[PDB]
Write a protein that binds this DNA or RNA. Structure first.
Lengths: 224, 129, 88
RNA sequence: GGCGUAAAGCGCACGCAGGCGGUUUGUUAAGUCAGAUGUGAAAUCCCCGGGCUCAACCUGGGAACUGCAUCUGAUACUGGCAAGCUUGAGUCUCGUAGAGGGGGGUAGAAUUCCAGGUGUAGCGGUGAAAUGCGUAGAGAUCUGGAGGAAUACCGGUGGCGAAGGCGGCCCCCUGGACGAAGACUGACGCUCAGGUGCGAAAGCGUGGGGAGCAAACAGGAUUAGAUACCCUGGUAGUCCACGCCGUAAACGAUGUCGACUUGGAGGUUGUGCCGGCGUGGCUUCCGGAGCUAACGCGUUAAGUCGACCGCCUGGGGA
């Protein structure tokens, strides 16, 4: 991917001037009508070498965790992980996914037992209300943990949209030494990101571009 | 008023390194140029140049190794209110030789090792580590 | 404050060109003129402490400029303090 | 080593002595540096040997005395001297806003008092009362007159001042700040013990003035008591001229000056180019790094530095 498709889908358009992070000055091209512009001429190579690092990562069977939890981007990140043989999170990043893996693993096992029970008839011999509670627990356990259910252990990499919206996963990785590749807007803090990528992390077109880039390139890595 | 331009130069270096500035600029002086030649020749700064005839401006190009500042600690030692001179036998050791002390001797502004090799003492300008 | 005409007059008198307004003699002479003028103001307005602080600033500044001229050139100094009618 | 809140920034300043001193060259060689010479008694400390049966002890030999003086040399830095320079500091021009100060004058609203017209039995006060006031006509309302004090609205974490402080309008005298263009001087600077000045309110002296308010005082209530809180009166004082006092939680509980270090949202006054982008001075709120015991401070620092000053050293006594 390149400057053209970024500038066409709405990558370059940033957040307002009163919200930039002074650590985002060098990647800023300029300003217009009190909204910033992200310098694509820097965005393209850093992003593509992050894609190169990730392509190398999937070739060593390193599992990637897709991290995007905005309401209008849950289906985009889930599809990108669905079409990629990966693990993902698109609802509220629980405090303790990564640093507290020992206890979240128990709720993952609980979701596994409920998912066996869901396609099993187990909720017939119960009194129609305990079974309903089981179904609601299944619903919420799918909503939250249904993207990392088969992970089985800690991951090796992270891909993030709006590093500050998901700063908890960034900090959890930095607690555990998981390298992170995060779409870092002007309003984002990159001090916790190893491979950073400027670009509009809200515009659905730009976001699905970054997502398709990483998904296709991980597909390429697993092709090898 | 400004009463220690050397202190201002060390402060500008320190603050620029703490703010990750690439280079610092200041009013120039011959003595500042000697200090900066010692700094650059010992690998603490990268480069410097002087621009201007009637009002020279001295720019120091700072250097960072793994992102972090090369100048770990720099301190004024002899100051206008307390001048500090050492004989050749009492020249100080900064960080046990890993650092340097910038010494002004009768032969010019030099490092503590050079002053010890030349067998001279002088005013102890600053510790650099 | 001194009017423009008074300033022009003293500046021509004590400066060595029509445009010399920064030299010590002109500064000392302008301060002396304002001090002398304000003597009458402070004979009538004894309680005007706030303006007297500015008067004292003029006196201190003239003292500083006169001592500077003395340590820089004695001859111009004695000529000035005789022309201006100052003790020292 | 400290000084926002633990003890600690003088109430604020001007400023002599003292301390410190932007930049270029020359010159000096005082400080500084180097070498040498004389002296720095011996003993003692230190080392390597010896004999006391060993150690104490003694003792051979060897190093130190870190200073002073003189002579001979270097001249980077500091100092002196000379000439400069303009970036600091200052002067001039034009303009800008201002409760900055001193004096005089005046306007309107309100309270109180005096005289009067209408008029009658209440007013006033409070939790409730009572003291007080009213038929000798109050309270209410309308008019005329006197006097003192303060200036509603504007009004603003707005402005001006060194601080204390400064608020209606006009005039006279007067200080400072900021901005933009250039010129001019050419380090004339910064800090400051002692000194000196200014310094809220209360208070003191002399002479005035006195509407309102109000220490004291008197009465009425409250209460177990109530030298109070509440009520009704009310004198100093509050006001003016001059002199004195010199203190406040005189506070940002934060000394002054200079330089440097990511950001966002307000106010006010300048000024630039075409409501829009630049560039100035002071000012509000948040917050980054950093700092901090924490609370917090955070380009208006409590951050990073330099110059000078003031102060602290457990609580009580004090």
């Amino acid at each position: 991917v390149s400057m053209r498709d970024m500038l066409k889908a709405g990558v370059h358009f940033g957040h307002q001037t009163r919200y930039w992070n002074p650590k985002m000055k060098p990647f800023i091209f300029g300003a217009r009508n009190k909204v910033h512009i992200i310098n694509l001429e820097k965005t393209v190579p850093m992003f593509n070498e992050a894609l190169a690092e990730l392509n190398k990562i999937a070739s060593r069977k390193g599992k990637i965790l897709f991290v995007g939890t905005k309401r209008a981007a849950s289906e985009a990140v889930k599809d990108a992980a669905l079409s990629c043989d990966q693990f993902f999170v698109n609802h509220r990043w629980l405090g303790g996914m990564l640093t507290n893996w020992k206890t979240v693993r128990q709720s993952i096992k609980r979701l596994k037992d409920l998912e066996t029970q869901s396609q099993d008839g187990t909720f017939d011999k119960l009194t129609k209300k305990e079974a309903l509670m089981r179904t609601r627990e299944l619903e919420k356990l799918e909503n939250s943990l249904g993207g990392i259910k088969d992970m089985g252990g800690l991951p090796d990499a992270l891909f993030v949209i709006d590093a500050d919206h998901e700063h908890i996963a960034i900090k959890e990785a930095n607690n555990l030494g998981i390298p992170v590749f995060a779409i870092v807007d002007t309003n984002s803090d990159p001090d916790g990101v190893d491979f950073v990528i400027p670009g509009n992390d809200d515009a659905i077109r730009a976001v699905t571009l970054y997502l398709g880039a990483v998904a296709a390139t991980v597909r390429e890595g697993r092709s090898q | 008023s400004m009463q220690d331009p050397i202190a201002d130069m060390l402060t500008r270096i320190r603050n620029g390194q703490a703010a990750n500035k690439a280079a610092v600029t200041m009013p120039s002086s011959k003595l500042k140029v000697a200090i900066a030649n010692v700094l650059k020749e010992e690998g603490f700064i990268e480069d410097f140049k002087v621009e201007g005839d009637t009002k020279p401006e001295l720019e120091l190009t700072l250097k960072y190794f793994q992102g972090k500042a090369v100048v770990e600690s720099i301190q004024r030692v002899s100051r206008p209110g307390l001048r500090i001179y050492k004989r050749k036998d009492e020249l100080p050791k900064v960080m046990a030789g890993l650092g340097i002390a910038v010494v002004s001797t009768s032969k010019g502004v030099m490092t503590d090792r050079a002053a010890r090799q030349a067998g001279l003492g002088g005013e102890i300008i600053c510790y650099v580590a | 404050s001194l009017s423009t005409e008074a300033t022009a007059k003293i500046v021509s008198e004590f400066g060595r060109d029509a445009n010399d307004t920064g030299s010590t003699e002109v500064q000392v002479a302008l301060l002396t003129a304002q001090i002398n003028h304000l003597q009458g103001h402070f004979a009538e307005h004894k309680k005007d402490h706030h303006s007297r602080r500015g008067l004292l600033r003029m006196v201190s500044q003239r003292r500083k400029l006169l001592d500077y001229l003395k340590r820089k050139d004695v001859a111009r100094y004695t000529q000035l303090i005789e022309r201006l009618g100052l003790r020292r």
